[PDB]
Ligand binder design. Sequence first.
Ligand SMILES: [Zn+2]
Ligand SMILES: [Zn+2]
Ligand SMILES: [Zn+2]
Ligand SMILES: [Zn+2]
Ligand SMILES: [Zn+2]
Ligand SMILES: [Zn+2]
Ligand SMILES: [Zn+2]
Ligand SMILES: [Zn+2]
Ligand SMILES: [Zn+2]
Ligand SMILES: [Zn+2]
Ligand SMILES: [Zn+2]
Ligand SMILES: [Zn+2]
Lengths: 156, 156
Amino acid sequence: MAREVKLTKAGYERLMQQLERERERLQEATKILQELMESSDDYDDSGLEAAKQEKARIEARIDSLEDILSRAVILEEGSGEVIGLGSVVELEDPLSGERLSVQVVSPAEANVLDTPMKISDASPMGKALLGHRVGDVLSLDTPKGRREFRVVAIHG
Amino acid sequence: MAREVKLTKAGYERLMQQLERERERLQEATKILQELMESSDDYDDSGLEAAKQEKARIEARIDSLEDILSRAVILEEGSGEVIGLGSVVELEDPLSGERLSVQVVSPAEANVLDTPMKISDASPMGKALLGHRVGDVLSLDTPKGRREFRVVAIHG
Ligand SMILES: [Zn+2]
Ligand SMILES: [Zn+2]
Ligand SMILES: [Zn+2]
Ligand SMILES: [Zn+2]
Ligand SMILES: [Zn+2]
Ligand SMILES: [Zn+2]
Ligand SMILES: [Zn+2]
Ligand SMILES: [Zn+2]
Ligand SMILES: [Zn+2]
Ligand SMILES: [Zn+2]
Ligand SMILES: [Zn+2]
Ligand SMILES: [Zn+2]
């Protein structure tokens, strides 16, 4: 298990802040879990179980985050291509290791059906990406939860 | 759990090197417990469980290491005092968080009974320490296993 992960300075400091946030959430999560154990001694309750799960969950995002960081290799500042119109961008979610491909195009070229989905220039995600390069880390709006992805490559 | 850990460029390089080694051992240990799983189907043998235990041990050494590197704060090259004769040195074992205190003196001043035990100048541990500063990481001989310690401070 030895792979290098390229990140720009900004992309690196971005995963740090995320690690900082996660540790605080863990502290709060841990704290509530104990107060939840002393109270309803009976922990066969869905609550105590949902709490168990949340802490563990946070533990996961953090251990995964420390891993990514330990493999980090900082790219030069001015380096690689930039993401612009027509560019096809490959993304990885640090935690889940989920791959996501998307291509930024003009508003009228946007289409959900295309192979790498075509995203409007002025769409939320299109904005967020436009201007970034491999290594950068961006936060993208999600219904279930704002996630941060890493620019793995810009084939476009 | 948010504490900064000071390391010298050399100290950081040494823990990274230790991390690499441990991942290696996790590959070998992982592959082994799987071979030991298809053979003696009966997992109730003192072998397969001495195997998972080992893999678990390794995974802990690794994650503990990733945690420490994530908090690394690189110190200025020429910084802090240096360890010499008469210097009191406090050390911490990154893994177990064990704290050890020792004082480098002349071979004839050596005494295990003195508060911070007095270690010979030309002794093993003494040679290893001499010439280092806070932040450095040193591998110290142990019958149980050459472990690595961090110079937390040289109050001497
Ligand atoms: Zn459960
Ligand atoms: Zn970790
Ligand atoms: Zn890892
Ligand atoms: Zn177009
Ligand atoms: Zn950028
Ligand atoms: Zn939504
Ligand atoms: Zn904090
Ligand atoms: Zn072992
Ligand atoms: Zn882990
Ligand atoms: Zn791990
Ligand atoms: Zn941790
Ligand atoms: Zn941690």
